[PDB]
Write a protein that binds this ligand. Structure first.
Ligand code: HEM
Ligand SMILES: O=Cc1cnc2cc[nH]c2c1
Length: 289
């Protein structure tokens, strides 16, 4: 399976910056969502889940086809809660009907990260909607109740190594878990992108507890929580070294996350040699907007 990036006809950087801006302005406007967390975290999760279906072996899944728009994927139990992100993006897609679904979902994630003061994430356009029969089956997204060995093996399917996995997981600084969504509850409720995931892992006094859904999760008195898969990053000595690195170097985390997140969003896509270079969008703040 080959998916060649095809730039939306006649579109250039300015077009996608307009879309970025519309997303960012709405992020600013709809500030009440999820007890004032806002839509930032759920948009990042959405971009990851539409990408995380990829299988390097046969190039099925991936962000390219925008298949989350189809009920099989939309209704994946692993995607519970993401409908909020999709609804957020609906009016953006109405305003810019020319953008592909894959481009919109992935751009939503990039916009969210940047607007939440995260690293710049270069982003390339050209994903093309594919038919409903190309929607990957449920069950390609990761379980949270597993250990480091599971996480490592899982991410090999997405062609991610230890450093890429540890960097990507830093997105768990964002937002919170919702019992009704995932069977996990609580967390920092933050909407600012920092390396705090790693500092929390290393610095909090974690207690393995059972939540109201009868699932185990690690909790701190400060009110933070870690999934078993999160906590596995300090149980595995190779992961632990990287956690310590990011806990002690904000810039390095930002740079590595940016690369890994772009890679994640671009897995499965062939970019022609004469495709535009990746765009780096200005934040609203950089634009004085
Ligand atoms: C082993 C890998 C992973 C597991 C098991 C996992 C699992 C979860 C679970 C269970 C939640 C709670 C969802 C809810 O109840 O609302 C969550 C939230 C979230 N995840 Fe992950 N995740 C993983 C990797 C990632 C990656 C790679 C990213 C992005 C790079 C990411 C981004 C997020 C974000 C931003 C949230 C907060 C969503 C919100 O606040 O609504 N996760 N994750
Ligand atoms: O409190 C830390 C925290 C916040 N959000 C998430 C999401 C998954 N794991 C998390 C942990």
């Amino acid at each position: 399976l080959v998916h060649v990036a095809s730039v939306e006809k006649g579109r250039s950087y300015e077009d996608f910056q307009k879309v970025y801006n519309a997303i960012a302005l709405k992020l600013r406007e709809d500030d009440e969502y999820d007890n004032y967390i806002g839509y930032g975290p759920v948009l990042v999760r959405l971009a990851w889940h539409i990408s995380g279906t990829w299988d390097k072996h046969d190039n099925t899944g991936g962000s390219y086809g925008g298949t989350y728009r189809f009920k099989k994927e939309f209704n994946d139990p692993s995607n519970a809660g993401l409908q909020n992100g999709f609804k957020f993006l609906e009016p953006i897609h109405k305003e810019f009907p020319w953008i592909s679904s894959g481009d919109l979902f992935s751009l939503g994630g990039v916009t969210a990260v940047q607007e939440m003061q995260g690293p710049k994430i270069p982003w390339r356009c050209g994903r093309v909607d594919t038919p409903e029969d190309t929607t990957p089956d449920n069950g390609r997204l990761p379980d949270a109740d597993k250990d480091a060995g599971y996480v490592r093996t899982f991410f090999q399917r997405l062609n991610m190594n230890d450093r890429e996995v540890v960097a990507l997981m830093g997105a768990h600084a964002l937002g919170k878990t919702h019992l009704k969504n995932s069977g996990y509850e609580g967390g920092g409720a933050n909407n600012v992108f920092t390396n705090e995931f790693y500092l929390n892992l290393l610095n909090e006094d974690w207690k393995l507890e059972k939540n109201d859904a009868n699932n185990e999760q690690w909790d701190s008195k400060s009110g933070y929580m870690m999934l078993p898969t999160d906590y596995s990053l300090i149980q595995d000595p190779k992961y632990l070294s990287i956690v310590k690195e990011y806990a002690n170097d904000q810039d390095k985390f930002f740079k590595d996350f940016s690369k890994a997140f772009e890679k994640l969003l671009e897995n499965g896509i062939t970019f022609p040699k004469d495709a535009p270079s990746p765009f780096i969008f200005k934040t609203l703040e950089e634009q004085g907007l």
